[PDB]
């Protein structure tokens, strides 16, 4: 019916109006202090005043670090942008890692714009061009004007088209009897389909039949758009959307990432500030999430030191599970969580704690509830004891083979024999390591 994958039993942080976390609500069990700190961070993000704040989630493996970031993303809502990253994604072969980090920084700042469009639309009834005096004169096009007759509901208009508009008109392969849509902001033309006023069953090109557009031919409408700053940066960097030669050739070449200079970013910031001052724009800062932060090296950390001190950069959430580890790209420095101390000085560390037997048991119970399985109480106790003995994730991932083995025996509940058979068929890390130690030829 539905697809579940290691998550989606979590719907939020699960707090009341005072910020006090319940013991079990919202799909979360335990970790009260971390959830309250994440609620404070959520309120700070919703305040929309700060810039360049950062927190770090530190804890052991399998303790709920990525779960808290996904709970923050669910508590914020879909309107606030959220860019999840892994630390290995910043190394690209097309552009340096500094530009990729700045791109992901600019990808987490949203914007909402009320946009006004001048629209000519209707049904094409007359398509008549007229010619130039000397078509082989070398300079100037072949034709001079194109007369287009458009008919909408309760209206009819005639237009004398520029040839440059007619290139986009004839690139869409319009004809007499087609409903078109001309956008005067960019010159883009959309061919909607054949009109339904004529016959239907005499076509061979699986076309779509559309009634006449309501209202007049010439229109003005207001459109609310959601746009990030990185979208404006890559739109101005590779210009596609005009009707000129360069904008036409921009759509045909193979795209490649380029080092966008800071001058373009200053110009985009100036235009966005003008749009905000005009009262048609609203700025929505977001969250950038970098999981497995220990994969970064010293150069990206040193650039991140500068990039957090700008006046645009969003809230950055990191995560790591290292105790005292040398930073990558260095030889002999040793720093907590693989994060250098100059970056550590600008953070706010949120500690995460391991679980107990009862918390493991109720987590197993809720994840068996989500996966639509029925578990007996003795099998649940055995699964909780296994989770304490080996791993929480190993007891989590043994539920579905137990369900398959129960279903092959024509049963609905999960009993102790299925758990024992899944133990015997499937191994964990410790038993595999113990087998590898007592092995013959590097098993």
């Amino acid at each position: 019916v539905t697809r579940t994958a290691a998550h989606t039993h979590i719907k939020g942080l699960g707090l009341d109006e005072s910020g006090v976390a319940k013991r079990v609500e919202g799909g979360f069990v335990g970790q009260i202090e971390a959830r309250e700190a994440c609620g404070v961070i959520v309120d700070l993000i919703k305040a929309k005043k700060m810039s360049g704040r950062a927190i770090l989630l530190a804890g052991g493996p399998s303790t709920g670090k990525t779960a808290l970031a996904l709970a923050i993303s669910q508590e914020l809502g879909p309107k606030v942008p959220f860019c999840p990253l892994v630390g290995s994604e910043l190394y690209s072969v097309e552009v340096k890692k500094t530009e990729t980090l700045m791109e992901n920084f600019r990808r987490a700042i949203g914007l909402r714009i009320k946009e006004t469009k001048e629209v000519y639309e209707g049904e094409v009834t007359e398509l008549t061009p007229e010619d130039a005096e000397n078509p082989l004169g070398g300079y100037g096009k072949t034709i001079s004007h194109v007369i287009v007759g458009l008919k909408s509901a309760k209206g009819t208009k005639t237009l004398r088209l520029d040839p440059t508009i007619y290139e986009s008109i004839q690139r869409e392969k319009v004809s007499i009897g087609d409903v078109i849509y001309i956008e005067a902001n960019t010159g883009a033309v959309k061919r909607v389909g054949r009109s339904d006023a004529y016959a239907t069953e005499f076509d061979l090109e699986t076309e779509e039949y559309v009634p006449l557009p309501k209202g007049e031919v010439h229109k003005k409408k207001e459109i609310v758009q959601d746009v990030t700053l990185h979208d404006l940066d890559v739109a101005n960097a590779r210009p596609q959307g005009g009707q000129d030669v360069i904008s036409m050739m921009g759509q045909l070449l193979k795209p490649k990432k380029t080092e966008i200079t800071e001058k373009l970013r200053q110009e985009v910031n100036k235009v966005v500030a003008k749009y905000i001052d005009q009262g048609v724009a609203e700025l929505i800062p977001g969250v950038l999430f970098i999981d497995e932060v220990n994969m970064l090296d010293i150069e990206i950390f040193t650039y991140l030191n500068k990039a957090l001190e700008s006046n645009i950069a969003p809230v950055v959430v990191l995560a790591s599970n290292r105790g005292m580890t040398t930073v990558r790209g260095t030889e002999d420095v040793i720093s907590p969580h693989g994060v250098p101390p100059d970056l550590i000085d600008r953070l706010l560390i949120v500690r995460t704690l391991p679980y107990d037997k009862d918390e493991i048991r109720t987590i197993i119970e809720r994840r068996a509830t989500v996966e639509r399985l029925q578990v007996e109480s003795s099998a649940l106790d055995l699964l909780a004891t296994m989770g304490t003995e080996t791993s929480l994730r190993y007891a989590l991932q043994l539920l579905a083979p137990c369900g398959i083995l129960a279903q092959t025996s024509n049963r609905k509940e999960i009993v102790v024999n299925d758990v024992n058979e899944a133990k015997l068929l499937f191994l964990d890390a410790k038993r595999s390591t113990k087998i590898l130690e007592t092995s013959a030829n590097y098993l």
Partner: protein, 442 residues
């Protein structure tokens, strides 16, 4: 095709209770691993859960890639099975995470349902109006059956399909509307007066009777990575074959995810997950493992199967040693299947199956000698000796491999151990680690 190493395996050899038969479907022995692989296969065919990592481990020549091939044969068609090696991630054109993302998204299939209309009839009249340069093309087509007669309008693609495999006003054709396919079935009129240039030797068929137009429902499977490459740029269908899909941006991927969810909501499309098999997973950097640790937690993730044969070896990209060459973060969120070595009876059954596959007839004494030398040396050496002894068998003109043919094949070709013995005996003739050799024999 030809005869490959795993060409004798058709399925996993399991009953309805997921209990492995000892000798069935080309797989012998290894009952625990076969039962576990059947459990994984039923988990894949369920299609409910996502992002499970399965690890197959053991000594070399044990049946790991044989188990993966058996799973892929039992999976059947229309479910994607992406099988890659560990060294294919490293490229000069894409990053490691981008190649891993493409390999992940190649294993998710989308089944799209389409409504089409089939037109089969006899061509009566063709009118084609083209401009002077031949660019703008339009016209009308008059087709008939034994009951009806309809005039259709033609576009550019229809005229291009007509002017290829040229129809000559009396051929019986079939047109699919949604696919744009024109198929010339044959000629029914058999006109006498014909130009002496083309062949026009088509077969004689009858004019079709009944309804000219028929509605039909068709389905087809398209991978997610195909949709990303198609919507990436203008000529993405060429990039599906040339492989020039350079670092597709994330906005394309999340818009494709939203559109796929919309199509599932509308009832148009359904999502079919698959299996991604990574053989020799130990040849991956720690950055690839760190990316896999987060890519396994997405909803659009397939069942990842990894196979390795290393013991406690050094993880690539670091300076410490780990079991199976994998860090403990990946080993925590993975489930391990352990394969075990064989007896002499399983070796004999394997050799008999491989001899039956290669159409090689063996005597009982030759099979016993091959079983003994596969017990002493590796199994793969005694598997490889069979065709060599077969060619020696027709070199003395008898179609039955005897003991002397196996003895001659053992004499001419060497093991791993015998070559090591000869090198350690005659070290002065080979170039060693320091580049020292003695070529002169005086």
């Amino acid at each position: 095709s030809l005869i490959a190493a795993h060409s004798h395996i058709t399925g996993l050899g399991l009953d309805e209770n997921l209990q492995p038969r000892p000798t069935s479907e080309g797989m012998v022995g290894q009952l625990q691993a076969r039962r576990a692989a059947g459990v994984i296969l039923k988990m894949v065919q369920n299609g409910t859960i996502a992002g499970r990592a399965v690890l197959v481990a053991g000594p070399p020549s044990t049946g790991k890639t044989a188990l993966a091939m058996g799973v892929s044969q039992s999976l059947g068609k229309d479910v994607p099975f992406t099988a890659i090696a560990g060294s294919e991630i490293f490229s000069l054109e894409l990053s490691k995470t981008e190649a891993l993302t493409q390999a992940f998204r190649k294993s998710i299939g989308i089944k799209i349902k389409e409504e089409t209309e089939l037109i089969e009839g006899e061509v009566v009249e063709i009118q084609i109006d083209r401009s002077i340069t031949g660019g703008h093309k339009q016209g009308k087509l008059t087709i008939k059956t034994t009951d009806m007669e309809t005039i259709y309008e033609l576009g550019n693609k229809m005229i291009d399909g007509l002017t290829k495999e040229k129809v000559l006003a009396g051929d019986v054709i079939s047109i699919d509307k949604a696919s744009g396919k024109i198929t010339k079935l044959g000629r029914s009129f058999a006109r006498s007066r014909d130009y002496d240039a083309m062949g026009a030797d088509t077969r004689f068929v009858q004019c079709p009777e009944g309804e000219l137009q028929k509605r039909k429902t068709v389905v087809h499977t398209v991978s997610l990575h195909e949709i990303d490459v198609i919507n990436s740029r203008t000529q993405g269908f060429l990039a599906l074959f040339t492989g020039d899909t350079g670092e597709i941006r994330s906005e394309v991927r999340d818009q494709i995810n939203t559109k796929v969810a919309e199509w599932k909501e509308e009832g148009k499309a359904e999502i079919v997950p698959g299996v991604l098999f990574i053989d020799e997973v130990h040849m991956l950097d720690i950055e690839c493992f760190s990316f896999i640790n987060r890519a396994l937690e997405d909803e659009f993730a397939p069942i990842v199967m990894m196979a390795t044969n290393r013991g406690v070896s050094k993880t690539r990209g670091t300076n410490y040693k780990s079991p199976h060459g994998l860090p403990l973060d990946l080993l925590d969120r993975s489930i391990i299947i352990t394969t075990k070595s064989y007896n002499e009876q399983e070796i004999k059954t394997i050799l008999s199956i491989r001899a039956q596959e290669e159409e090689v007839e063996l005597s009982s004494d030759a099979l016993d000698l091959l079983t003994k030398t596969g017990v002493e040396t590796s199994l793969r050496y005694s598997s490889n000796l069979i065709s060599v002894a077969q060619q020696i068998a027709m070199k003395r003109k008898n179609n039955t491999v005897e003991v002397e043919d196996v003895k001659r094949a053992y004499l001419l070709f060497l093991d791993s151990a015998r070559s090591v013995k000869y090198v350690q005996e005659n070290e002065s003739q080979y170039i060693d680690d320091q580049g020292n050799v003695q070529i002169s024999i005086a």
